[PDB]
Write an enzyme that holds these catalytic residues in place. Structure first.
Site, PDB file in Angstrom:
ATOM      1  N   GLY B  52       0.822  -1.274   0.076  1.00  0.00           N
ATOM      2  CA  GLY B  52       0.133   0.232  -0.083  1.00  0.00           C
ATOM      3  C   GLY B  52       0.826   1.306  -0.085  1.00  0.00           C
ATOM      4  N   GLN B 125      -8.677  -4.265   3.301  1.00  0.00           N
ATOM      5  CA  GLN B 125      -8.121  -5.550   4.101  1.00  0.00           C
ATOM      6  C   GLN B 125      -9.412  -6.328   4.367  1.00  0.00           C
ATOM      7  OE1 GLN B 125      -5.704  -4.640   7.806  1.00  0.00           O
ATOM      8  NE2 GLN B 125      -5.134  -2.426   6.771  1.00  0.00           N
ATOM      9  N   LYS B 172       0.998   6.421  16.937  1.00  0.00           N
ATOM     10  CA  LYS B 172       0.027   7.372  17.597  1.00  0.00           C
ATOM     11  C   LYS B 172       0.027   8.677  16.840  1.00  0.00           C
ATOM     12  CE  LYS B 172      -1.068   4.277  19.088  1.00  0.00           C
ATOM     13  NZ  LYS B 172      -1.723   3.195  19.883  1.00  0.00           N
ATOM     14  N   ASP B 235      -8.798   2.051  19.702  1.00  0.00           N
ATOM     15  CA  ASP B 235      -8.685   3.065  18.751  1.00  0.00           C
ATOM     16  C   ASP B 235      -9.862   3.696  17.600  1.00  0.00           C
ATOM     17  OD1 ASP B 235      -7.675   3.371  15.418  1.00  0.00           O
ATOM     18  OD2 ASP B 235      -6.364   4.282  16.849  1.00  0.00           O
ATOM     19  N   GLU B 239     -11.364   7.716  18.278  1.00  0.00           N
ATOM     20  CA  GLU B 239     -11.687   8.718  17.433  1.00  0.00           C
ATOM     21  C   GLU B 239     -13.083   9.122  17.126  1.00  0.00           C
ATOM     22  OE1 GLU B 239      -9.220   6.199  14.765  1.00  0.00           O
ATOM     23  OE2 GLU B 239     -10.976   5.102  13.900  1.00  0.00           O
TER      24      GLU B 239
HETATM   25  N1  LIG Z   1      -4.245   7.024   8.224  1.00  0.00           N
HETATM   26  C1  LIG Z   1      -3.841   7.148   9.526  1.00  0.00           C
HETATM   27  O1  LIG Z   1      -3.774   8.212  10.066  1.00  0.00           O
HETATM   28  C2  LIG Z   1      -3.475   5.899  10.127  1.00  0.00           C
HETATM   29  C3  LIG Z   1      -3.705   4.505   9.706  1.00  0.00           C
HETATM   30  N2  LIG Z   1      -3.711   3.704  10.549  1.00  0.00           N
HETATM   31  C4  LIG Z   1      -3.889   2.578  10.308  1.00  0.00           C
HETATM   32  O2  LIG Z   1      -2.822   1.954   9.116  1.00  0.00           O
HETATM   33  C5  LIG Z   1      -3.821   1.153   7.872  1.00  0.00           C
HETATM   34  C6  LIG Z   1      -3.379   1.605   6.629  1.00  0.00           C
HETATM   35  O3  LIG Z   1      -4.085   2.720   6.522  1.00  0.00           O
HETATM   36  P1  LIG Z   1      -3.551   4.306   5.527  1.00  0.00           P
HETATM   37  O4  LIG Z   1      -2.373   4.472   5.786  1.00  0.00           O
HETATM   38  O5  LIG Z   1      -4.866   5.046   6.116  1.00  0.00           O
HETATM   39  O6  LIG Z   1      -4.106   3.494   4.113  1.00  0.00           O
HETATM   40  P2  LIG Z   1      -5.248   4.237   3.419  1.00  0.00           P
HETATM   41  O7  LIG Z   1      -6.513   4.200   4.056  1.00  0.00           O
HETATM   42  O8  LIG Z   1      -4.482   5.764   2.746  1.00  0.00           O
HETATM   43  O9  LIG Z   1      -5.216   3.087   2.046  1.00  0.00           O
HETATM   44  C7  LIG Z   1      -5.016   3.863   0.543  1.00  0.00           C
HETATM   45  C8  LIG Z   1      -4.006   2.669   0.034  1.00  0.00           C
HETATM   46  O10 LIG Z   1      -4.702   1.332  -0.080  1.00  0.00           O
HETATM   47  C9  LIG Z   1      -4.530   0.794  -1.469  1.00  0.00           C
HETATM   48  N3  LIG Z   1      -5.752  -0.147  -1.641  1.00  0.00           N
HETATM   49  C10 LIG Z   1      -7.056   0.487  -1.667  1.00  0.00           C
HETATM   50  N4  LIG Z   1      -7.892  -0.622  -1.969  1.00  0.00           N
HETATM   51  C11 LIG Z   1      -7.075  -1.729  -2.103  1.00  0.00           C
HETATM   52  C12 LIG Z   1      -7.162  -2.986  -2.560  1.00  0.00           C
HETATM   53  N5  LIG Z   1      -8.799  -3.440  -2.667  1.00  0.00           N
HETATM   54  N6  LIG Z   1      -6.332  -4.020  -2.447  1.00  0.00           N
HETATM   55  C13 LIG Z   1      -4.905  -3.496  -2.462  1.00  0.00           C
HETATM   56  N7  LIG Z   1      -4.769  -2.128  -2.085  1.00  0.00           N
HETATM   57  C14 LIG Z   1      -5.628  -1.191  -1.807  1.00  0.00           C
HETATM   58  C15 LIG Z   1      -4.611   2.062  -2.111  1.00  0.00           C
HETATM   59  O11 LIG Z   1      -3.828   1.749  -3.723  1.00  0.00           O
HETATM   60  P3  LIG Z   1      -3.801   2.750  -4.865  1.00  0.00           P
HETATM   61  O12 LIG Z   1      -2.482   3.340  -4.850  1.00  0.00           O
HETATM   62  O13 LIG Z   1      -4.325   1.775  -5.957  1.00  0.00           O
HETATM   63  O14 LIG Z   1      -4.912   3.698  -4.501  1.00  0.00           O
HETATM   64  C16 LIG Z   1      -3.932   3.073  -1.397  1.00  0.00           C
HETATM   65  O15 LIG Z   1      -2.435   3.005  -1.807  1.00  0.00           O
HETATM   66  C17 LIG Z   1      -5.257   1.184   8.334  1.00  0.00           C
HETATM   67  O16 LIG Z   1      -5.522  -0.187   8.970  1.00  0.00           O
HETATM   68  C18 LIG Z   1      -5.250   2.231   9.563  1.00  0.00           C
HETATM   69  O17 LIG Z   1      -6.168   1.731  10.323  1.00  0.00           O
HETATM   70  C19 LIG Z   1      -3.174   3.844  11.962  1.00  0.00           C
HETATM   71  C20 LIG Z   1      -2.586   4.725  12.344  1.00  0.00           C
HETATM   72  C21 LIG Z   1      -2.942   6.156  11.752  1.00  0.00           C
HETATM   73 MG   LIG Z   2      -5.549   6.599  17.559  1.00  0.00          MG
END
Ligand SMILES: NC(=O)C1=CN([C@@H]2O[C@H](COP(=O)(O)OP(=O)(O)OC[C@H]3O[C@@H](n4cnc5c(N)ncnc54)[C@H](OP(=O)(O)O)[C@@H]3O)[C@@H](O)[C@H]2O)C=CC1
Ligand SMILES: [Mg+2]
Ligand SMILES: NC(=O)C1=CN([C@@H]2O[C@H](COP(=O)(O)OP(=O)(O)OC[C@H]3O[C@@H](n4cnc5c(N)ncnc54)[C@H](OP(=O)(O)O)[C@@H]3O)[C@@H](O)[C@H]2O)C=CC1
Ligand SMILES: [Mg+2]
Ligand SMILES: [Mg+2]
Lengths: 517, 501
Positions: B52, B125, B172, B235, B239
């Site tokens: 990702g 996921q 965090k 978590d 939020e």
């Molecule tokens: N965002 C935050 O602030 C925080 C997030 N987290 C956790 O970390 C994890 C990652 O979240 P986050 O960083 O927000 O990621 P995102 O929600 O930003 O996800 C986007 C990425 O996921 C890919 N994607 C979307 N759909 C699919 C699919 N069907 N199959 C494979 N890849 C896919 C996209 O690829 P493409 O390039 O093709 O669009 C893109 O690169 C999450 O579980 C979240 O709960 C934890 C703390 C903070």
């Molecule tokens: Mg948090």
């Protein structure tokens, strides 16, 4: 994947009653017209039954028991209606004041009733059902019938992965109105042929072929003007969603948001309430009940028609957003779980305090409602605000479309989105404000309104009202589709089956819940 | 009831003990100087597969690549993406290429990775986990930055495969910040984003060390111990609570009340949003909740207590409801279905998330900020503070009785709000705070903010207007609560500088 879900229109087999075909915008659907002259058919309908057990004395309990105590009675049958209650119940007598006593074998313990009844009516809290179903199923007489007035238990059992016992028959008659409204129009049907509350029926499990007619007989005995066919599956998905939609939750949120908008725009408090609560539950409710949504638009001025369109075009989609979300929470079983846990939270556990439901009508606008009604003349219908009409009708059409695309029959859609709202519930809000409408409904409906009302208020203020203020071009397809929508003609066909007496809801009603009198 | 005394075995890293309100916990300090431990920490790893490229993806991969790196390790940091991803030439701009073998296909990466981090979206996921588990090497490790996947699996009566170790390292803070503070952590010591770690499954005995290694590689100054189940429960609830949901909710309710009582719009915004996100935040951050109260004047204290006593239980009502929705599997289910409603299905329109800052009060906030002095932190209103602290205490208590550790409670209910998230709302308003978080958080804030607004207006504000006598043992509980002493200890275990950008 994917796109599209057609209308399932179920066909039932009756040998006692007269099954009637109804055409709703090209859809064949089957109903049974009730009446006081159909009562001699009840012994034929209730064969194999010797005792009917009404378990619970809440909202439907008092109404259904007394309606079944009559008619039976008017059919001179041997079957006994017996009330089952928990030892030391607060709503125990009550039942003796209604007529049911220990001496005549019409009142006793819950589990003595369940065991000694051929037809058991589970008219207790939906959450209570979920936490006590095993206890009830065990007392059940072998090869007997369990009757429900809601599919909440099935939705719960499916989440847990189980199903109803296979040794018992499972039916449901669900009055498409509140408990007080069931008894109140009967009463008004003892003098005039019709008058009652529309009901849906479901046959989940048929053990011996008696199920359909027992459900039909039970529906006619309640006084249902028309009884339409559904499944427990379809019933709880539409009903739990409905009360959270236009019926209680959505209309509340819409009313709160519009009142706040008008007062921010300079309109004084008292006129703002009249343009929102009084209008929706006055002319709008009455105009829809007798002529439909199209006639609401037509009666408006040329200036008003544009205002209606501005509101509808901006409100339709934001309203759909929340309704779409809500339905899927119900259908997946998340909302049923939420109701069950909330019911548990009414008492102290895990070192945390007890949280009963609070008052929802102590805020700014509902105190304005007190002042408005105190000097309001009788038979008042309120002013018709064009912008308010646009929002409310948009909400109605959004609910229709959701259920339509989720594969419900038109009768279920029209009752859940149009009829029950304008006929049954809205007068209560016109009579004494939001709480008199919401808190007279079931605890599931009450919890539902409190949870989802805020979501409609926010979506209207954040999106719909912002669209109007940005002065965005009117969506011409939405307006064109509203005018040509198949539901408007389908509502006209349904309105023919409506009981031709309006529900009389006085301020000091005795037929309401014994704590809001 | 119940308290989570949580311990773990680490052979390579140095474990240190902390006492929080009488409860023992174990912490792992980070730092640039612990990087030579990474080779041994990732003992049997030859390749880390970061799946990702959105928010967490880019930051963590760069934070791993730089770091081992400093360890001089052979470990390859490979980026895996979908066949039709739009992030390919973005990753090549970051120096992840096929020529180096540091960028490839999503499924080619998982199969050839000893440690695969699933940093794709939560909705992805949940609807692609099967294909992922099949691509895992037996005895390889699946790393998570959130426990969403477990909650989704648990609510379906399922779990991760037996032959795979499951770990979690959860920063965090948001993606952009994790990298921003890592590169500053090269200049000034202690800079970075704190994390919590979990070990769900451990097939060989490597998982506990690998997680810690991954955490310190990201430049986590402090790493806290939790379970994967407690992580997502705290978590997802967090939020929707004080972090985004409730703070927006109460802010809308208070602004409305003040303006309705005849207060100037801009003054009302200052007394609500500016105060909470600026001075109230700063005071709690530096010296805790008791300093908010003790800093107030004698008539202000009477106003604080009025607000606290009236707001505490109504706030708890929604938090208590929300948490049980998260634990039961209802809320995760809601997020999944909401994610699917971003595209057209079942003959219905697509419903993406709309704007939340186009209403009256946030337009007012724009006029306030346009002429606002730099260095301004806003006024400390005693009633506003009464509500906010009541909310904070209510969330602490709900998590406490539901069995969460103090470090997890404090980070989730106190620190991340005042240090990390609130400054965003002070900077540019509610949308800038909420919509810079993960999708599951953005849906959370939108669903639960209205719930806090309504109950506070329906119950809390009515109580004040009745002039109900102050619930004295509620106030006595806030004053004497052992959590304040635990917050003092936790505040020392904190990143060295600001995330306030
Ligand atoms: N965002 C935050 O602030 C925080 C997030 N987290 C956790 O970390 C994890 C990652 O979240 P986050 O960083 O927000 O990621 P995102 O929600 O930003 O996800 C986007 C990425 O996921 C890919 N994607 C979307 N759909 C699919 C699919 N069907 N199959 C494979 N890849 C896919 C996209 O690829 P493409 O390039 O093709 O669009 C893109 O690169 C999450 O579980 C979240 O709960 C934890 C703390 C903070
Ligand atoms: Mg948090
Ligand atoms: N209310 C309405 O207007 C409508 C209700 N329905 C449906 O009809 C059904 C009947 O509910 P309703 O009439 O609202 O009653 P309520 O939901 O208000 O429940 C109150 C009754 O349930 C009993 N009860 C509560 N807990 C238990 C328990 N643990 N064990 C045994 N009994 C218990 C109470 O007994 P006690 O007297 O001892 O307190 C009380 O009589 C519901 O399933 C509802 O979905 C359908 C349409 C409308
Ligand atoms: Mg109903
Ligand atoms: Mg119901």
């Amino acid at each position: 994947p994917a796109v599209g879900a057609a209308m399932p229109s179920l066909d039932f087999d009756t040998s006692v009653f007269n099954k009637e075909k109804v055409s709703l915008a090209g859809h064949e659907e089957y109903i049974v017209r009730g009446g006081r002259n159909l009562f001699p058919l009840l012994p034929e309908a209730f064969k194999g039954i010797k005792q009917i057990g009404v378990i619970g004395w809440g909202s439907q309990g008092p109404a259904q028991a007394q309606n079944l105590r009559d008619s039976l009675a008017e059919a001179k049958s041997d079957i006994v209606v017996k009330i089952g209650l928990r030892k030391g119940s607060k709503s125990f007598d009550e039942a003796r004041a209604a007529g049911f006593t220990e001496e005549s074998g019409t009142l006793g313990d819950i589990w003595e009733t369940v065991s000694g009844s051929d037809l058991v009516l589970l008219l207790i809290s939906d959450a209570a059902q979920a936490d006590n179903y095993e206890k009830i199923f065990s007392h059940m007489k072998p090869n007997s019938i369990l009757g429900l007035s809601h599919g909440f238990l099935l939705g719960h059992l499916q989440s847990a992965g189980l199903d109803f016992p296979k040794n018992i028959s499972v039916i449901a008659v669900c009055p498409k109105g509140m408990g007080p409204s069931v008894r109140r129009l009967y009463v008004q049907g003892k003098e005039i042929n019709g008058a009652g509350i529309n009901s849906s029926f479901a046959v989940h499990q048929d053990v011996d072929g008696r199920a359909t007619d027992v459900a039909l007989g039970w529906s006619v005995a309640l006084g249902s003007p028309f009884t339409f066919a559904t499944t427990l599956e379809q019933e709880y998905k539409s009903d739990i969603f409905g009360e959270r939609g236009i019926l209680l939750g959505a209309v509340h949120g819409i009313v709160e948001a519009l009142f706040r908008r008008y007062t921010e725009q300079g309109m004084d408090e008292e006129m703002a309430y009249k343009n929102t609560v009084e209008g929706i539950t006055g002319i709008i409710s009455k105009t829809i009940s007798k002529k439909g949504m199209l006639e609401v638009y037509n009666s408006l001025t040329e200036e008003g028609k544009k205002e209606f369109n501005k509101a509808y075009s901006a409100s339709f989609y934001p309203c759909m957003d929340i309704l779409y979300e809500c339905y899927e929470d119900v259908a997946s079983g998340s909302e049923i779980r939420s109701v069950v846990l909330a019911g548990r939270r009414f008492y102290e556990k895990e070192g945390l305090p007890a949280f009963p439901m609070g008052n929802i009508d102590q805020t700014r606008m509902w105190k304005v409602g007190e002042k408005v009604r105190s000097t309001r003349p009788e038979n008042d219908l309120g002013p018709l605000h064009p912008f308010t009409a646009g929002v409310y009708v948009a909400l109605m059409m959004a609910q229709i479309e959701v259920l339509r695309k989720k594969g419900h029959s038109y009768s279920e859609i029209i009752n859940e989105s149009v009829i029950e709202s304008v006929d049954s519930l809205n007068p209560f809000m016109h009579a004494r404000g939001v709480a008199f409408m919401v808190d007279n409904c079931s605890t599931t409906a009450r919890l539902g309104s409190r949870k989802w009302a805020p979501r409609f208020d926010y979506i209207l203020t954040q999106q719909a009202f912002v669209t109007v203020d940005k002065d965005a071009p009117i969506n011409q397809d939405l307006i064109s589709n509203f005018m040509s929508d198949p539901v408007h003609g389908a509502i006209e066909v349904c309105a023919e089956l409506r009981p031709t007496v309006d529900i009389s809801v006085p301020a000091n009603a005795d037929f309401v819940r014994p704590e809001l009198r």
